[PDB]
Design a protein around this ligand. Structure first.
Ligand SMILES: Cc1cc2nc3c(=O)[nH]c(=O)nc-3n(C[C@H](O)[C@H](O)[C@H](O)COP(=O)(O)OP(=O)(O)OC[C@H]3O[C@@H](n4cnc5c(N)ncnc54)[C@H](O)[C@@H]3O)c2cc1C
Ligand SMILES: Cc1cc2nc3c(=O)[nH]c(=O)nc-3n(C[C@H](O)[C@H](O)[C@H](O)COP(=O)(O)OP(=O)(O)OC[C@H]3O[C@@H](n4cnc5c(N)ncnc54)[C@H](O)[C@@H]3O)c2cc1C
Ligand SMILES: COC(=O)c1ccccc1CS(=O)(=O)NC(=O)Nc1nc(OC)cc(OC)n1
Ligand SMILES: COC(=O)c1ccccc1CS(=O)(=O)NC(=O)Nc1nc(OC)cc(OC)n1
Ligand SMILES: Cc1ncc(C[n+]2csc(CCOP(=O)(O)OP(=O)(O)O)c2C)c(N)n1
Ligand SMILES: Cc1ncc(C[n+]2csc(CCOP(=O)(O)OP(=O)(O)O)c2C)c(N)n1
Ligand SMILES: [Mg+2]
Ligand SMILES: [Mg+2]
Ligand SMILES: [Mg+2]
Ligand SMILES: [Mg+2]
Lengths: 599, 599
């Protein structure tokens, strides 16, 4: 092979530093330690990238995830061996579940100490095998550029995801003394395959042109291409097809559009769920038919199943990964590869549709029958969490600024999903597949680093926020003016919801003792605001959003409020529990009796 | 025939509750979630044990470790699937490295959903394989009692360690219909081997009786038996053998005893290191010759190696785990099994030594010329961190209470180890093998739960404390009046030491921005105290330990103060860097010069 000598004489650490600029890395999230010292010495004062220092490595990981979701670039993490590495397992597993591109670099003990139960040695490659797309231990400095290039390529192609690169201390401290192949130092289709994909596209167009009640079921995959939302909208307009998104597709479709069905699934709106259950054709675009979406699989999409049996519909799946094709539902047509690219190729084959009067009339009736109803504020009552989301959504949107929302995990997360009006791609950043509490704050910090001009709001739960609240001071140190909203119901609400519904109001260890959030914000160097009274909510939300610098707003909200609608257990998507104020009142009395007045 | 029907009609969750009682568990540390709901329902209002709720599952893990180190009982952790499980990887790796008995129960998605990339599904058995002695996924409720009994047995036998038991939701929700073998529901050596051990004991006695300059090298293994320290003291008195301990053996030997050599190793005292390098016989008791202890292995113990070649000494190893014998160093005699048990069998074969005048004269000369020296306070100077430990040591002892000390990781940890006078077993609880920053606070909480009557002090670093400071509120909820001391040098001191020494004072990302610790303590519901002035120190320390409830004391200490002595790099144990006041003053000028005054 051709040889490259440009790195000869540099340490592994210096080569790392150089590769970052070559991989277009502008930001690194990390925390130093012994094993990774030679790399830290090499990036000392580097103007190649901004370095962000969290208080805990899990924070670096979630920051990198938020950065990635906001920027479209891989999040880069740099931590030490042992506990440095084990502390990023959660964010890696999280990134793997949600398809987030991340490259995690972990220091490792010298190669000669590996396998001796050495100081701060973990089998990181073993530990992270099942929660990365790929991982590797670099065994020589000669190998370092190759592994870095492979890592970035793997993380950002196919379905994006995390990769881990283990860096032994002797490798990063070693000087490169051999020339290395030029192929290894530079970053970065079958004809029958292309023709096959084009065939599948022709068939997909044929099926779509045949459908009388189609639904577009859209997920995160459409957001992995700049033109995704635009092409989705063009197809929806051209063929008059209503659009529902998963939790992770929120923002990919303008919810102000009359063809918007909002979110489907366990806590999706009834209209989206009913449309899916009655559709003759489901066009799945960058979504993986997760169990939180389909409800009971045997009851899922009966009209599409009927249509398939009669050769006049079923399910079309635009999917980039073979692992996810036919994994859950039998698929009539799989269109393999990037969804956006394939929609573009399909477009001209779709017959323009004048109208779908009957289908849209039915959908509009469902919209009138089943809004996201809930128990609203009454005199003397506590503030309702759903109301907070609705008001903040309007206040934030009215600034005219680009707005990005992150969340923790639980009821507040579902209410954010439901009651915010989603209009822009890459503006909702939430932990869906793994559902990691504590995601909200560091993800917001990372997102703010990616988009310094954006209004970044973490809509968080009190228990979620406790998980990673130490990163408040990191936000100040990083100069990220994040807006932290805590919907404080003094409970792990999502868990108490399940305990209310399925365990006869037995609240087993679901009430953590919260700190004073306002004094905490002040201790951490932020402005802290609290609202308790209905009458002050509007003014406080405006002050919150208008504040220059990072700010925390705690809203005391009502407790034991269920997220509805809800599809759970053996229920099909059309068998949801709906909001009913009389039932809520009865369940409240029942709860007080069963808990002996404790809750 | 011998089938048991007492669990018939119980859910797996309810069986779990009963099994905790049979295993004499009095405390469970955990955090609930969806997959583990059936177990939480079953333990709701349980009178079998107390439950401790942290803010983060890593907190649960470290609390359980602290609880285990202080009580001698396995720490039990109960968390949910997915992120709940991945959040306990660090404590498991930590407990694995330090040999701490822990049984981790993780909820898992239903067996039907396993392997489908389900909601909150992680491959927990795969992930935790390298950091547990043993793990298992329970596949039927019939199998549940068996796996629980196996878990506890493995965790507490041989070298103690963490085990993981994965609990699918359908298994814990399932009702046992079938009788199960009675033996599976009840908790819990060849005479050839016994003779072989006896043979080794005989040979080891002869070698000891022959030694002229013997050293007892004592580790954590001696603390795994109630009679350990007693038998250690007996052997030391009888054969007049000086005793040095590892970091993890601290407290096993009375440091007030004239035969104490204090701690050996990288930051051990000079006398201990010199004694080890000049010994003709090293008697290793429950210690694994870690790289932080031996220094450059090829320079380690030359006098014992010399003696081994002439058949007049060498190394004796009392080790419970066969894989840790002849793992680091060539051993003349290995005594397999429990160290304490084997010391008891050996004692009567040891010849009582009158005196070792020459050996102890040499040792006492070293003690006089190489004490733990450091730069002491001067008028107008900042408080020295070594001085705080010394004073706190005395103030804590004067309370008359049983004192337990935990720490974070870094310089403060080494200073705690060096400058405290250790006299009682199971009173120093620190992360040694993995070295996990953030260990200090949750370990203290766990220790306080184990020993409600003890004075528990977390001597912590500012950076370490930031890692897990959210658990402050958990301490209040748990009713544990821990005393938290922060030696605040506004730096990752241990890392800056290495950067000062080996990287020409290039401080790459080792200065994190701290919150106001006093305001933080108050927000968290604790009393907060601060000391800046030398004159205030004694009074504040006294107020600190005299405070009834939980309390945080921040002491502002001098920065860029190295931990000495220090053995690093290619250095042997006798080639340590020692303290010198003029060199320190020179280092200060050099540092100021190189940092432009910033550090
Ligand atoms: C408390 C809670 C409640 C929840 N309830 C709901 C709910 O009610 N409704 C809901 O929808 N979700 C819900 N979830 C989230 C759910 O668990 C999943 O995370 C989510 O549904 C996954 O959405 P997705 O399929 O669009 O994204 P992903 O999981 O990221 O899947 C994307 C799919 O598109 C593919 N893909 C990626 N890139 C491309 C590309 N360039 N071209 C083509 N294909 C591509 C991927 O391979 C993958 O198959 C909930 C989560 C939590 C924590
Ligand atoms: C910043 C830092 C600095 C450090 N510097 C030092 C230092 O200067 N000096 C030092 O000593 N440590 C130091 N360490 C700690 C070091 O890394 C190890 O954790 C420590 O040396 C291990 O001590 P140990 O061998 O006694 O315990 P362990 O690691 O737990 O090993 C105990 C051995 O005894 C065996 N054993 C267990 N139970 C029994 C039994 N019942 N019978 C017989 N055998 C048994 C075990 O199998 C094992 O082989 C440092 C750590 C940090 C974070
Ligand atoms: C981090 O451990 C190692 O990389 C390691 C492990 C096993 C064998 C050899 C090494 C390399 S090392 O002996 O030179 N130590 C090192 O690189 N860093 C180092 N940093 C400290 O504080 C930052 C403290 C400290 O020991 C307590 N070691
Ligand atoms: C934890 O996930 C499951 O155990 C699981 C995963 C895949 C398939 C089936 C299940 C069981 S389940 O559908 O009945 N859900 C469940 O047990 N808990 C549950 N808890 C929530 O918050 C407490 C929220 C929530 O979905 C958002 N699911
Ligand atoms: C790390 C982690 N631990 C446990 C869970 C299980 N869990 C899911 S939602 C939830 C409660 C969240 O409470 P909160 O953050 O306050 O949001 P709320 O539902 O009250 O709005 C819990 C404990 C989880 N998702 N992640
Ligand atoms: C989780 C984790 N991350 C990183 C490290 C690397 N590390 C070891 S000691 C140290 C500095 C600790 O600073 P501090 O807690 O303030 O103690 P100090 O040395 O200043 O007394 C670091 C960053 C570690 N041991 N653990
Ligand atoms: Mg909406
Ligand atoms: Mg809550
Ligand atoms: Mg001492
Ligand atoms: Mg410090």
């Amino acid at each position: 092979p051709d040889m490259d000598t440009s790195f000869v004489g540099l340490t592994g650490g210096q080569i790392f530093n150089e590769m970052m600029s070559r991989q277009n890395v502008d930001t690194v999230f990390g925390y130093p330690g012994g094993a990774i010292l030679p790399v830290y010495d090499a990036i000392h004062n580097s103007d190649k990238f901004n370095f962000v220092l969290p208080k805990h490595e899990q924070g670096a990981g979630h920051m990198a995830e938020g950065y990635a979701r906001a920027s479209g670039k891989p999040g880069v993490v740099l931590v030490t061996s042992g506990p440095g590495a084990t502390n990023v397992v959660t964010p890696m597993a999280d990134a793997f579940a949600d398809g987030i591109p991340m490259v995690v670099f972990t220091g490792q003990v010298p190669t000669s100490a590996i396998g001796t139960d050495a100081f701060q040695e973990a089998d990181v490659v073993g530990i992270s095998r099942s929660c990365t797309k790929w991982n590797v231990m670099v065994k020589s400095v000669e190998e370092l550029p190759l592994r870095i290039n492979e890592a970035f390529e793997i993380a950002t192609s196919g379905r994006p995801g995390p990769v881990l690169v283990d860096l032994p201390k002797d490798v990063t401290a070693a000087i490169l003394r051999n020339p290395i192949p030029t192929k290894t130092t530079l970053p970065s289709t079958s004809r029958a395959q292309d023709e096959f994909v084009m065939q599948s596209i022709n068939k997909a167009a044929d099926l779509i042109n045949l459908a009388k009640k189609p639904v577009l079921y859209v997920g995160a995959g459409i957001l992995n291409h700049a033109d995704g939302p635009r092409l989705l909208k063009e197809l929806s307009d051209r063929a008059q097809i209503p659009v529902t998104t998963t939790l992770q597709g929120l923002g990919s479709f303008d919810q102000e559009d009359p063809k918007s069905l909002d979110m489907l699934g366990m806590h999706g709106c009834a209209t989206a769920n009913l449309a899916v259950q009655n559709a003759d054709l489901i066009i799945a675009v960058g979504a993986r038919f997760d169990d939180r979406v389909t409800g009971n699989i045997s009851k899922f999409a009966p009209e599409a199943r009927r249509a398939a049996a009669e050769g006049r519909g079923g399910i079309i799946h635009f999917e980039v990964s073979p692992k996810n094709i036919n994994k859950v539902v039998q698929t009539q047509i799989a269109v393999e590869g990037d969804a956006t690219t394939n929609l573009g190729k399909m477009m001209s084959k779709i017959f323009p549709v004048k109208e779908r009067s009957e289908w849209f009339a039915q959908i509009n009736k469902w919209k009138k029958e089943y809004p996201y109803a809930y128990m609203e504020e009454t005199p003397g009552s506590k503030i309702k969490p759903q109301t907070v989301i609705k008001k903040l959504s309007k206040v934030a949107n009215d600034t005219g600024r680009h707005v990005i929302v992150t969340t923790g995990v639980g009821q507040h997360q579902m209410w954010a999903a439901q009651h915010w009006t989603w209009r822009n791609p890459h503006t909702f950043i939430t932990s869906g597949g793994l559902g990691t509490m504590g995601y909200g704050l560091p993800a917001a910090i990372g997102a703010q680093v990616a988009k310094p001009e954006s209004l970044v709001i973490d809509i968080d739960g009190d228990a979620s926020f406790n998980m990673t609240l130490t990163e408040l001071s990191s936000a100040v140190q990083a100069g990220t003016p994040v807006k932290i909203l805590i919907l404080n119901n003094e409970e792990q609400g999502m868990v108490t919801q399940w305990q209310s519904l399925f365990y006869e109001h037995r609240y087993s260890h679901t009430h953590q003792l919260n700190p004073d959030f306002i004094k905490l914000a002040e201790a951490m160097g932020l402005k802290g605001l609290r609202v308790k009274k209905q009458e002050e909510l509007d003014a406080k939300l405006k002050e919150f959003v208008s504040t220059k610098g990072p700010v925390l707003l705690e809203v005391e909200v009502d407790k034991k409020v269920p997220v509805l609608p809800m599809v759970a257990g053996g229920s099909g998507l059309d068998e949801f529990i709906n909001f009913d104020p009389e039932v809520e009142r009865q369940q409240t009395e029942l709860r007080h009796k069963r808990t002996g007045g404790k809750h």
